[PDB]
Symmetry: D2
Subunit: 325 residues, 4 copies
C-alpha cells in the first residue's frame, strides 16, 4: 500500500471524454492571451496548447499549470502532436507567419494544421484569429470541409471593441452602454455603420445627420480612423497586440461554449449578400452558440456602405482565386 | 451644441477619487500578468501602470484599454510620473530586470531608492506588495525606505512556491490543488522549507499515515515534490525565458484578500523578528492573515528542529546581506 | 494563554471604517433576493440588514452567515438599530406595507432620517412601491442632492421587455436592446424607436411596430411586460428573483463606478414639458456619485404625452402627502 | 416574411440539446435557493424545474426567466412531466416535507426517482431532502444507479457552519479554517478534532483538551452550535435556505466542472469502520464529472469510529422497515 492507496479508496477508474475542451493553436502573445482569458473565465474543463516551437510550448504549459490553485480548469495539456487536442468543442487558431507571399505562407501553415485538427476533433468549431483573418477563415473552411456555421473568423470583433472604447471615452459612458458596429473586412478597410451608433437606443446619426461624413463639424470619422491608428500605434509602441485580442476572443468563446446566442461582429461567408457572389468571408453581426454561427443579422446599409463591402469581396476573391491548396 | 450635449444632460461635474485603486510598478512579463489577472478578477475601479520605458508603458496601457468592453475596471492610466498612482489602496512592485544574487540586490535596491519614496508621496496609506527579487530582501528594503508599519509591507514570498507545491501534490494524488493542503515557508526560492507536518487532504496528515514522508528513507520519494518546486522554476526559465502566468495569478489572489478584507491566510513574507530564535530585522514567509490593513496577524507554525534550523540559517544569511546595505 | 493567542500573533487590532459597505432595509422576499444577488456578485465587503421584525431579521442574517465559506463578503451584520448601517456607500430600501402610498410614507418617515444619521454621504436606491413616488419621498425626507437618490424604476420593466424580445427573436436578451421608460409598472412607456439588434432599428424595418394595427402584435411584448408581473403575483404570491438580480445590476454600476446606462427613476422636472418635482425613469449614467448624467431620449408626441400624464398623476398624489 | 425573418437570416435550423443541463426537483425555499445560486455561478446551459404544485412552479420559472438579462443560462424550463428533465447531467432532489417524516418522503421518492432515471439514466443524483442520509440510500435502491452517481448533500453544510464558527472564534476567514464534520447529517454528526487546523497547524496538538469536557474554552460547543443553529434558524425564520443553496451550488460546481475537490457528502460507507449495512454517511469524497470517484479514508479515533458505527446501526434500523 502506497500513501495514495492508504489515503484514498477508489470507487471507479472509468475516466470519461472531456466535455468542455478548448484547444489553442499557436502559443505566441495572442494565443497565450487567449489562453489566460479563457482560463480566468472558467469556459473549459480541459485546455490544450499546440505549437511547433517545443521548448516554448512546454514552458507556457507548465507556467499555466503552476497557477492551477487559482483556476477552475483541472487539466492543461500541450504537445506538438494533435492527439493532445482530441475531442475539442472549440479550436482557436492563432498560428501564422512582399505580402501576397505572406498569404500563401499562412495557407501553407493551414494545410498542415487544419487536417490534423479535423482528424482529432471532427465535430469542433473553428475560430480563426490568424491574419489576414477573412482570407484565412475561407482557407480553414476550404481545407476543413466544415459547414459554414462551424468556421468563424475573429473578424471585426476587436475592431468594434476598440470603436466602442473610443466612443465611450468621447461620451464619458462605459463602452458596454455605447453601441456601434464596425463591419466588413477586418483591419484597414473596415466599415463603421454610422446609422447603428447609439446610446440607450438614441441614434447618434438621427441627432447629428452629418455624423461620419466630411461635413461633420466634430469629425466622428476620426473615431474609426483612430480604430486603425490605434492598432498601428500599439505595434509601434510594444511590438505586438495581445491583451485586447485575448479578451475579445474569450468573449466569443463564452458565447459558443455556453450557447448564449449573443450577437457578435465576426467573419462569416457573406455570399448572396450585398450583391456579392464569390466565396468570401466578411464580418456581419452573427448569432453565436454551440453550433457556431447559426444566424446573421441583415444590417440595412447605405449604397456607399454596400459598395465598400463589395470592393472588399472583389479584392478578397482576387487573392483567393490565385491561392494554391 | 455638441453631439454629446444633445445626447447627454449633466447633473454634476464633481470629480471624485478612486475607491479601490491598484498600481502596478514595472510592466514586464510579471507586472502585466499581474495586471490582466487583477483586471479579470474585478478587484479595482482604477488601474495605474508605471515603468521607465515610456513607449512599452503606453502600448501596454492602450492594449488593456482596448479590452475595456470585456472588463469592469472603468479607468486604466499610465505614466513615468507617479502622479498617476495617487490614492492607490495597493501598490505592487514588479520592477527591475529579471536576474549574481548580491549584484541583483545591489541594482534592485538602487531602483527601490527611487520607486518607494514616489509611491509613498502619492499613496501614503497604501499597502505595498513586493514581488521583485530577491523578494525577502527587497521586502525589507521597501519597509526600511518607506517607513511604513510592518502590516503594510508584504512580500510575495512563498505564495508561488506553495501554489507550485500544491499543484504537484494534487498531480500525485489525483485531487484538485484547492483540496491538497501544504505550506512551503521561509526564504522564497532555492532555500524554501516544506513543512511536512502540515501536508494533508481533508485534515488527514500525510506524515502521520506515512512517517518516512520527506525523509531519505521514503520509498515513494515525496521529498522530490519540494525539490520539483525548485526544479520547476528553473525549467520554466529554460523553456520560455521567464515566469509570468503563475506569479500573476498568485499575486491576484493576494490582492483579492487585501482589497476585499478577506482575512484569508497566505504564505507571504513578513518581518519575522521574534520567532524561531531570530533576533534580526529579516522578512521570511510564514502564514499571514491578509486583509484591508495588510498583514494584521501571523500564524505561529510548530517546526521541527531541522525546519527551524533552515529558517534560522536563511535569517542569518539575509541579515548578513542587509546589515551592509547603505540607505 | 488562549488557543487563539497560541496559534496567532497579532500585529495590530485596529479596525478600519468599512470601505465598500451595502445596507438592505427590509428582509422580505425582495430584500433577501437583493442580498443574495449582491453577495454572489462580490459587490460589498460588509453587508448590513435592517428590519422591524427582529426574529426574522436575525434568522436571515444567520442563514447567510452560515454560507460564508462560499462567499467573499467577510462581514454580515443586522439589527433593528441603524447603528449597524453606519458608513454604508449604498443603502437599498425595500421595506413597505391613496391609502397605501401614505402608509409607505409613514414607514419612510422613520427609515430615512435613521439612514441619513449613520450614512450621511450614501447613495439611496429605492425599491419599495410605488417606486417613483417613494423615491421622491426619500429625496424630500433625506435632503440629499438628486444625484444620490435613485429609484429602481423601470430597470426591471426593461429587463422583462428584453427577455420577451429575445424569446421572440431567438437571441439572448443582452443583444436585444429596448427601453421602457416613465412610470414603473402599469403606465410605463415602451420606446419603439430604440428597439434594435446590432444597431438595426425594428421600427424602421416594421413601421407598424408598437401600433394596434400591427399584424405581428409587437405591442403585446410591452403588454406582457405588465401582464407578466400580475401573472407572477397570481402564481407564486410575490416577485423576488428578477427584482433581486436587477437591483444587483444597479449596485454593481454604483459600487464599481462603471458609468453604464440604466433606466432608473430620477427627478425629471425640466424635461418633456414636465414642470413638477416628479421622478420617472429615463436612461441614466450610474457611478460612484449615483446619477451623474441622463440620456435625452427623443420621444414621439404620444410618448411625451404618456410621460406628462404620469407626471400629473404622480404629482396629484404627491402634493396631498403629509411628511 | 415576419420581422424576425426581415431582421435575421437563418443559416441552419439544426436544433440542439443542452450540453450542461441541471434539474432541480422541488421549488420550495431550498430548491429555489439551489437554483438562484446555480444560476449566479454559470454552471448550466439549461435549468429545468419540477414540482407537483403547478402554479408555484410556473411562477418561480417566470420569475427566474425575467432576470435572464443578468444571467448566462439561456433556457429555463419547468413542468410536472419529467420529459422537461431529459438528458440532465445533474438532478438535485429537494422535494418533500420539512418515523413518519421518513416514510412520507420515501413515498414521494417512489414517484420521483423512477421518473428521473427514465429521462436521465446517466445523471448524477444529488439528494438534499431530509433525512438526507436515509433518502440517499432510498434513491440509490430505487434508481439502481452505481453508488458513485448517488450523492447526498450530507455534512457539506454542517462543515461549512463549523468553519464559519471556527472562523469567528479565531478571527480568520472560513476558507482558511479547516475542520471536518462527518457521519450523519444533523444531531449525531461527528466533529473530527484531529483534523482541525489553520495553515496545517493542528489545534488538537496545540490544545490537547480540544473537544473534551475538560476544555476551558469549550470547543465542543462549537460542534453543538452546528447541530443547534439549524433549529435556531428554523425557529427565527421558519426554514433554512440560503446556506444550503450555497453549499449545493458548491457541490454542483465540482461535479459540473470535474474539479475533483474533496467535500464531505453522504456516500455508501459499508466496508469502513466495521460497518456492514448498506448505509450512507458523510466522509470526505472526491467529486467530479462521474460523481463520487473516490473517498478519503480519514483516520478516526476509537470513539469516532464507535460514533459512526452507532449511526450506521440506527439508520439501518429505520431502513430495514421501510417499504419500497
Ligand atoms: N484578427 C485579429 O484581430 C488579430 C489581432 C492580433 C493578431 N492577429 C494574428 O495572430 C497571429 C499571431 O500573432 P502573434 O502576435 O501571437 O504572433 P507570434 O509570432 O508571436 O506567434 C505565432 C505563433 O504561431 C506559431 N506557429 C507558426 N507556425 C505554426 C504551426 N504550423 N503550427 C503551430 N504553431 C505555429 C509560432 O511558432 C508562434 O508561436 C498573427 O497572424 C497575427 O496577425 C490577428
Ligand atoms: N517572488 C516571486 O515569486 C516571483 C516570481 C517571478 C518573478 N519575480 C520577479 O519579478 C521581477 C520582474 O520580472 P519580469 O520577468 O517581469 O522582469 P522584466 O525585465 O520582464 O520587467 C521588468 C520591468 O521593470 C521595469 N523597470 C526597470 N526599472 C524600473 C524603475 N526604476 N521603475 C519602474 N520600472 C522599472 C522594466 O523596464 C521592465 O519593464 C523580477 O525581479 C523577477 O525575479 C518574483
Ligand atoms: N420597484 C420594483 O420593481 C419592485 C418589484 C417587487 C417589489 N417591489 C416592492 O418591494 C416592497 C417589498 O416587497 P416584498 O415582496 O419583499 O414585501 P414583504 O412584505 O415580503 O417584505 C417587506 C419587509 O418590509 C419590512 N418593513 C416594514 N416596515 C418596516 C420598517 N419601518 N423598517 C424596516 N423594515 C420594515 C417588513 O417587516 C418586511 O420584512 C414592496 O413595496 C413591493 O411592492 C418593487
Ligand atoms: N440537507 C440539508 O442540509 C438541508 C437543509 C434544508 C432543508 N433540507 C430539506 O429540504 C427539503 C425541503 O425543504 P423546503 O424548505 O424547500 O420545503 P418546501 O416545503 O418549501 O418545499 C418542498 C417542495 O417539494 C415539493 N414536492 C412535494 N412533493 C413533491 C413531488 N412528489 N414531486 C415534486 N415536488 C414535490 C413541494 O410541492 C414543495 O414545493 C426538506 O426535506 C428539508 O428538510 C435539507
Ligand atoms: O492590432 C492589430 O495588430 C496587428 C496589425 C496588423 C496591421 C496593422 C496594424 C496592426 C499586428 C501586426 C503585427 C504584429 C502583431 C499584430 O497583432 C494585427 C491586427 O489585425 C490588429 S487589429 C487591427 C489592425 C488594423 C486596423 C484595425 C484593427 Cl482593429
Ligand atoms: O520561477 C521563478 O523564476 C525566477 C527564478 C529565480 C531563481 C531560480 C529559479 C527561477 C526567474 C529567473 C529568471 C528570470 C525570470 C524569473 O521569474 C524568479 C523566481 O523567484 C521564481 S519562483 C522560484 C524560484 C526558485 C525556486 C522555487 C521557486 Cl517557487
Ligand atoms: O412584478 C411586480 O410585482 C408587484 C406588482 C405590483 C403591481 C402590479 C403587478 C405586480 C408585486 C405585487 C404584490 C406583491 C409583490 C410584488 O412584487 C410589484 C412590482 O412593482 C412588480 S414589477 C411590475 C408591476 C406591474 C407592471 C409591470 C411591472 Cl414590470
Amino acid at each position: 500500500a502506497t500513501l495514495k492507496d492508504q489515503l484514498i479508496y477508489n470507487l471507479l477508474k472509468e475516466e470519461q471524454t472531456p466535455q468542455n475542451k478548448i484547444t489553442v493553436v499557436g502559443v505566441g502573445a495572442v494565443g497565450m492571451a487567449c489562453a489566460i482569458s479563457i482560463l480566468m473565465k472558467d469556459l473549459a474543463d480541459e485546455l490544450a496548447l499546440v505549437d511547433v516551437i517545443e521548448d516554448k510550448l512546454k514552458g507556457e504549459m507548465m507556467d499555466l499549470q503552476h497557477g492551477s490553485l487559482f483556476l477552475r480548469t483541472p487539466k492543461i495539456v500541450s504537445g506538438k502532436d494533435y492527439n493532445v487536442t482530441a475531442n475539442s468543442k472549440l479550436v482557436i487558431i492563432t498560428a501564422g507567419a512582399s505580402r501576397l507571399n505572406l498569404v500563401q505562407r499562412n495557407v501553407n501553415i493551414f494545410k498542415f494544421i487544419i487536417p490534423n485538427v479535423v482528424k482529432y476533433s471532427p465535430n469542433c468549431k473553428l475560430l480563426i484569429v490568424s491574419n489576414p483573418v477573412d482570407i484565412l477563415t475561407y482557407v480553414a473552411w476550404k481545407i476543413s470541409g466544415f459547414p459554414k456555421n462551424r468556421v468563424i473568423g475573429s473578424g471585426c470583433n476587436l475592431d468594434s471593441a476598440r470603436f466602442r472604447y473610443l466612443m465611450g471615452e468621447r461620451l464619458g459612458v462605459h463602452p458596454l452602454s455605447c453601441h456601434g458596429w464596425v463591419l466588413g473586412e477586418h483591419g484597414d478597410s473596415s466599415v463603421p455603420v454610422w446609422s447603428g451608433m447609439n446610446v440607450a437606443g438614441v441614434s447618434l446619426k438621427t441627432l447629428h445627420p452629418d455624423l461620419g461624413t466630411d461635413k461633420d463639424k466634430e469629425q466622428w470619422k476620426e473615431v474609426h480612423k483612430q480604430v486603425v491608428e490605434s492598432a498601428y500605434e500599439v505595434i509601434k509602441l510594444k511590438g505586438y497586440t495581445s491583451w485586447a485580442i485575448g479578451l475579445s476572443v474569450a468573449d466569443l468563446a463564452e458565447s459558443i461554449m455556453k450557447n448564449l446566442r449573443r450577437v457578435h461582429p465576426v467573419s462569416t461567408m457573406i455570399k448572396g449578400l450585398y450583391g456579392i457572389k464569390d466565396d468570401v468571408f466578411l464580418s456581419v453581426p452573427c448569432i453565436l452558440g454551440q453550433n457556431g454561427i447559426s444566424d446573421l443579422v441583415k444590417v440595412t446599409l447605405t449604397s456607399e456602405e454596400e459598395a465598400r463591402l463589395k470592393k472588399s469581396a472583389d479584392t478578397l476573391w482576387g487573392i483567393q482565386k490565385e491561392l494554391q491548396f
